[PDB]
Amino acid sequence: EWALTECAQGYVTVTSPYAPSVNRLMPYRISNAERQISQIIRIMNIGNNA
Amino acid sequence: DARAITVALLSGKYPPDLVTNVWYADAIYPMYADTEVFSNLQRDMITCEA
Amino acid sequence: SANLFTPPEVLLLPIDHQPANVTTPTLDFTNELTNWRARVCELMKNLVDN
């Protein structure tokens, strides 16, 4: 919710529960290096093509 | 096209009664229910892994 | 952050950004592009009167 609030520049409010949870698994966080590698690969695809 | 961009620069109007913090709160709200970004993150991870 | 040649979080623009301080906009002529249009019009006016 912090990320979503930040990315919307405060125009959207979202909420999260505040209580003992049951250990959900949400694998979405990766290092910047992987993002840069994927970005470079993606650039090389569109290389010189409109 | 230069003509089109000039037309855009010359003929812009706002809704008759605009309040930005309400307009954006109303417009942006649906678009942060999209979970495509996280999927892209997982795809990016697999790319470097491969 | 997938930025490569720019710092993370940073997004460049070819126009100077100046955050609005009101939520009820009204017409105003203190802008870069307004000045550009005014200068162009004045140049044409000088050209005609030569």
Next chain:
Amino acid sequence: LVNEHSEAKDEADEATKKQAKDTDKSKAQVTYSDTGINNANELSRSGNVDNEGGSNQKPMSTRIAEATSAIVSKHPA
């Protein structure tokens, strides 16, 4: 065999429905669901889990059935 979160939500809907009937109105004035609070982490007791914390997708008796059926030996040839 329904999810605890689902039951907490499903039970909320039924309570709201009977509220409307009790006050002879289509839309209930007071509701137990669709409130402001993000009560997502709520759990309700359900028949999906047993007392050992295991999944009740197979009943206790049947699990005991397979368990002790593998130890039996028959009269020799």
Next chain:
Amino acid sequence: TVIQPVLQDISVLLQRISPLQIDPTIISNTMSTVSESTTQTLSPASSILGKLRPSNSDFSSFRVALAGWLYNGVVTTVIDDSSYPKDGGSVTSLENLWDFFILALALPLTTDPCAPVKAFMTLANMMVGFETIPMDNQIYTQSRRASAF
């Protein structure tokens, strides 16, 4: 489902024992005023009546609210988010002002421990762009929804 009958039944008991009578026409007749025709249709006296809708004669919400006090430790009474102004609202809208009035005047009756904060923030939300306050958190802004507190 276990709780619902208990609260509802007590609420009916209170209604059929209290000497108090709820007569919405007290609001209606005491207005008895209306703006003229040539000017714009929006008028404050007419606008508030539409928000109140005196014709409707259901008050279970009031009756239940009293019963909620006896079971604070198991049931928390709150104001439904639909009662808050649309998209946070603004002080520039005559309609949104009445939403603030109705909501602010009714909050003290709920058992919500965070009621005062909600009563405060909902005005701040409407006030964005005219009046600014300092915020400690760099994530949360003044535009945070009030019902989230």
Next chain:
Amino acid sequence: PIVQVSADVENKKTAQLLHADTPRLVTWDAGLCTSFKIVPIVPAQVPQDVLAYTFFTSSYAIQSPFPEAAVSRIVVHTRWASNVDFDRDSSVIMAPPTENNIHLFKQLLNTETLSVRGANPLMFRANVLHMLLEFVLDNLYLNRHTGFSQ
């Protein structure tokens, strides 16, 4: 025959760029986390003229954790006991050594090999590497908690 094709017309880079398929990361396995299977090779010498049949355990129809045979061996068989929801479709399975297993080592570059019973030794390393990669890939699962009984 098997000589293949690689050239592909790829005008649909736009579809890739606008939307990419998500990988299947999380999968659940409810079976045994094993890939090695013990198999009988030669049936046991029962009954026999030395020991009476009343001695042997099999004669009482008792289940055994291990095969009751004259000879038994270990064979790799990925997910031979698993119970998964999504299949990764990369199983590595051999047969008992009394049964031929040549076809596993001629799967990669033996496009020139004529006989069905033969394989080229010079691609043994490549075939082995491919086999190991598939072995790893087929086992990417998360163990699942089912339930117990006293």
Next chain:
Amino acid sequence: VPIPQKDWTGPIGEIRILKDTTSSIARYLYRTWYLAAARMAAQPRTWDPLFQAIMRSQYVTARGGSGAALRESLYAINVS
């Protein structure tokens, strides 16, 4: 001299995409029509409702159109 059968992709409904490795002269015809379609579809006037209305009205004339065959063709699926 026909186009070799080994120079086509899988079907997309009814159509079949032509590969770019083809030794036939059809490749230039395909390229020309490709660029023509791309330039056509990018014109904003294509999406203007009036343009589409004009195109629809173009073939609405007081001349024959074999309406009878249309009639039994529609009756073949029980539409009156």
Next chain:
Amino acid sequence: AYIAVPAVVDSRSSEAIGLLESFGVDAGADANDVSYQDHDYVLDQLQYMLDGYEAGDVIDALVHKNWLHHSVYCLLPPKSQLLEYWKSNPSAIPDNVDRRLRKRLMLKKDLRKDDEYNQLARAFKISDVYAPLISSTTSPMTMIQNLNQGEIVYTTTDRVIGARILLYAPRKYYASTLSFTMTKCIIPVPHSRFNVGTFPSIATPKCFVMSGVDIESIPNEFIKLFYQRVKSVHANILNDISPQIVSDMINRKRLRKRGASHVDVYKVDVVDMLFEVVDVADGLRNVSRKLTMHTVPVCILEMLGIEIADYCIRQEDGMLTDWFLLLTMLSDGLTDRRTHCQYLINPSSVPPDVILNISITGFINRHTIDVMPDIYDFVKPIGAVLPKGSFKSTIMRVLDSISILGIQIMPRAHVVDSDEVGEQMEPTFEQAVMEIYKGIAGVDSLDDLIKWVLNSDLIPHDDRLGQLFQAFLPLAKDLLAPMARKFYDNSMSEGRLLTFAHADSELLNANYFGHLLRLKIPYITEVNLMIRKNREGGELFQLVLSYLYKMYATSAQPKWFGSLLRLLICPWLHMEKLIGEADPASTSAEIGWHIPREDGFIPYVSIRAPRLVIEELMEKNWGQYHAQVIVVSAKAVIKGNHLPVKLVSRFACFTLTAKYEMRLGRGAAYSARLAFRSDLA
């Protein structure tokens, strides 16, 4: 509990048909445990929505719908009509309205030139009264969220999705809306422990989804796209379950004929067949390859006994057995399970890639598909195009020996061979092709031509075959085409026939009339030639001929041959399970050309169906179609238009071909209309 299956589901119909066990889920005791939701109208709304939005975002929004929560739209009229509606019967005005407007609406005066009501109306909008509104500028996600909480959602447009649509004020007020899809009139359901719906939703952490991974196997286009998108976006948050799992969770505490209605016969169940090519050339074995067969109907598998065991597919002769031909003939090709490329079968016993013994392993997919090829608008003669070396004789022989229900479908007399046009000329086409060689420099004999065109590996040089085509094409287009035209013209006279050809361009250039089908085979056709001994000009000549025809063919994707045999057989075999016991006199019918002067009648179509179906057929306008009959060996010709297929039924499996003959004298050309001369009973 919610389970989504990759098929269209309806509340009343899908229950009568065994939809769950059309997939494989047993669900023995009903006990009113399984419930179905109607999703057809949702599919129609999706199709309508596709006219203003992208498919992807519509699907993404629709996924978040909770199907266990009840809500519905409420279509409203345009504003101007809404006010005038409130003027009539001023008893429906909501209390939220401005009191000035309400007082003015009850004025009972015409309000034509009030000049104060005008301003009030002008400064009025629907959103002032109804909180949740959709005004054709709303993202589908917003609509889905609005239906997720709340029972009534107000809208001013009909282009909405997710639930039913009710009407506000009577139809007279709605003038812009014309669609009659599901708009319920002004006139106004619980959930079982399990619920089955076509769509899969993520509104709950445990809304289950059927197997649904066989995306290619989904028949319907829209459902296929929906499932593909859903798994391509939310692959990691889905609860995939198998039919066995569904059977367990339905029959956990309990385990320890579709009633009576109209039955369609063009819905068949098919399965994927998994097997391997075990080689037992010695006492040991091999696991050479693992292959899959795709579209094998269950009816065939149950008809001819198929267990899972070590089957051998060759006889003492050395060629393949008949049942294996039929089985491979009814499918949609093979596929290797290691490399996912297509697979083709070597018929001959030539060392490279021989198949002698196979072993079945299991059956994975199961779903019901329609059999109607959908290019069957009118009952017309059928022309099938197969390449040379396609077991034509074997297929013809096998088909002829099928006498399922006393009708002997597809007799040898009702099929015409491809080569039949060849011997119409005293010098057949083949010897002209042989003599072509004289027109080529450097070639002095047909043998010289063969060694010139091939490169010692039975491959055309891809250039010399060029001049072979150069010389051959004029021969075909100048000699074969006209004689073929006359041959087909006469052939249509005797009645409906099955026609075989080698390249579709033959039929196109001959102006052939009837349904045109291009079919391929899961075999190597070229190898089928040179093993076939007793050839006239040598086998290599036949190879060259086959190459010439393949080059002669057009550019069009040939479907699998099974798509024809399935339609030819499966409906009849299914119907035998229902009609196999009843009295044939009642459950039989006949359609034919009537000619008044006992009475002249020549059969056209043979119909077999239950009594109710035949009785329903009895009252149809068979007199609408006319033909000219001439004369036992009679023959006729149709004028006007041919018979539409739906006139027969989606029931009442019939005969695809017929031969014209008069049952027991001057030659006459009187007239004809067809009559339902079926039977009295």
Next chain:
Amino acid sequence: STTSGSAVIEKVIPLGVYASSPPNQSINIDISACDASITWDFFLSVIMAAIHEGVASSSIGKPFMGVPASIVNDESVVGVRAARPISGMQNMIQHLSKLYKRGFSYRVNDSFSPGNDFTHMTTTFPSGSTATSTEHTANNSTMMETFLTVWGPEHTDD
């Protein structure tokens, strides 16, 4: 390419008078039975594919002429068989491709011959449609350019 009618006034007289005048020389080229020479074998199978592909980008998810969008099966890539949304123009292209592949069904009623009426299956391109002349001109120009650029230079040595 011109668009003039058969009235003598509206044509390009200057073109002809310039072409005939020496030292310029003119070549007169005509296509015999032009409508009968354009079938699915070579032309239609290519033009239909090209038009269908060269429109998806600038037109995704939009109706046209009353024709809506739809979903079709995809098999271009080997192995993978999927579904694919198409625009209104692509729907029209799919249907028109069906029609072109099948052929044409001509109905005849010979008024000068009693008993001469039937249906003739043909592959000849229609003459009464609105796309006849423009399509014929486009293919004429394209084939001429292809000859002048690629085939012709590669087939003569003088």
Next chain:
RNA sequence: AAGC
């Protein structure tokens, strides 16, 4: 039946 009788086009663009």
Next chain:
RNA sequence: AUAUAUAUAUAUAUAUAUAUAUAUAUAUAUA
């Protein structure tokens, strides 16, 4: 003041269709 045409409001009558309930007849299944 009278006649004709157009628009709005109210009342009454008639016809048709769809849904639910009751009665009788025919066909099939179960006891």
Next chain:
RNA sequence: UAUAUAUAUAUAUAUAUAUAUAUAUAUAUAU
């Protein structure tokens, strides 16, 4: 003899649509 499903005929209740008639108000034309 009882129960269930389908079809047909009659009656009651609800909704929609069309037509006719009467009265009142406004506008135009004629005496």
